[PDB]
Amino acid sequence: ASLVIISTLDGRIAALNDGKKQWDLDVGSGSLVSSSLSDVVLVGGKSLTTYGLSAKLRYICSALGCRRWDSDEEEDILLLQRTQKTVRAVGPRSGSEKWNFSVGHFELRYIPDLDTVIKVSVADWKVMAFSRKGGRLEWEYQFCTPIASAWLVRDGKVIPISL
Amino acid sequence: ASLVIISTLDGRIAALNDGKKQWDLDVGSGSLVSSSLSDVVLVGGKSLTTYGLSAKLRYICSALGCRRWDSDEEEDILLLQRTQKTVRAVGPRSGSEKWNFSVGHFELRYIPDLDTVIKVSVADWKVMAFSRKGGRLEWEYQFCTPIASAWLVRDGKVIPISL
């Protein structure tokens, strides 16, 4: 087929003449950004994990190891990794946390086994699909959450659909 | 009092005319270094945690929060943080891990509420205590594991006893 991948602010990945959704899968990492307020010591940690998707969770490889799932079909493959920076501030007196924040993002790689164009209206979080003229609209997908990152995955590679 | 703190390769912290041991406490992080062998994707993550010690675990603050313990006595305080870098290599085909390795270290800060000198023979992992002349030996502590980092904590600060 030929689909579009979308990384949103809530930390969500979605995939789409239509733009219908085929699947939307997330990870236990929450939003791609967070903040708070409640001499200091500061704790933290970045983490680059990796999620093996089909076109489905077959494995999750991280800095500790892998968690796998059953079933088969060979088949297709879609690499997906999550980079989550994180750091809290904490009073040396006692772990009372003055404040905290964290940022994150996804990146995409593909592993293997009639055109129009796509632009993303970040103002209204639209995924717009046009045509040729210039260009005439064909469809658009609206997300109920700010779009962080997006790519175009047709053939078997990954063009990053820019802001 | 007046004591000497020692960070060893196994990821262990120890404290010592004597050099007797008053306490030796560790964390669930294993050795300060590790390695292995079994186009690649690479997972990883650094983590800077913090351990609140007395002179005892009262709290462990990390990038996720705190775990505390009971009892009281005010009292004394000894800040101790662990920085653990870690990264595995993993085949894009499937999380089979081509290899992996990790490094780590501790650093010390003090929070409050007749001399001789100390050198560390890294060759035989000795903690040597001398005197004045020159200098004559008074005692030595031998560790059954390579010494990574060491400090001198007398008054209420931290001089790093060098290699």
Residue numbers in the entry:
A (entry chain A), B (entry chain A): 103 to 118, 122 to 143, 191 to 207, 211 to 228, 232 to 271, 306 to 355
Give sentences copied directly from the paper behind this entry.
The unfolded protein response is an important cell signaling system that detects the accumulation of misfolded proteins within the endoplasmic reticulum (ER) and carries out a cellular response that attempts to rectify the imbalance. There are three sensor/transducer proteins: Ire1, PERK, and Atf6, that are critical for initiating mammalian UPR cell signaling and give rise to three separate branches of the response. All three proteins have a luminal sensor/transducer domain that in concert with BiP is vital for sensing ER stress, an ER transmembrane region, and a cytosolic domain that propagates the UPR signal (Bertolotti et al, 2000; Schröder & Kaufman, 2005; Ron & Walter, 2007; Zhang & Kaufman, 2008). In an attempt to shed new light upon the mechanism of UPR activation and to rationalize the differences between Ire1 luminal domain structures, we determined the crystal structures of PERK luminal domains in two different states: one state is the previously characterized dimer arrangement as seen with Ire1, and the other state is a novel tetramer arrangement.
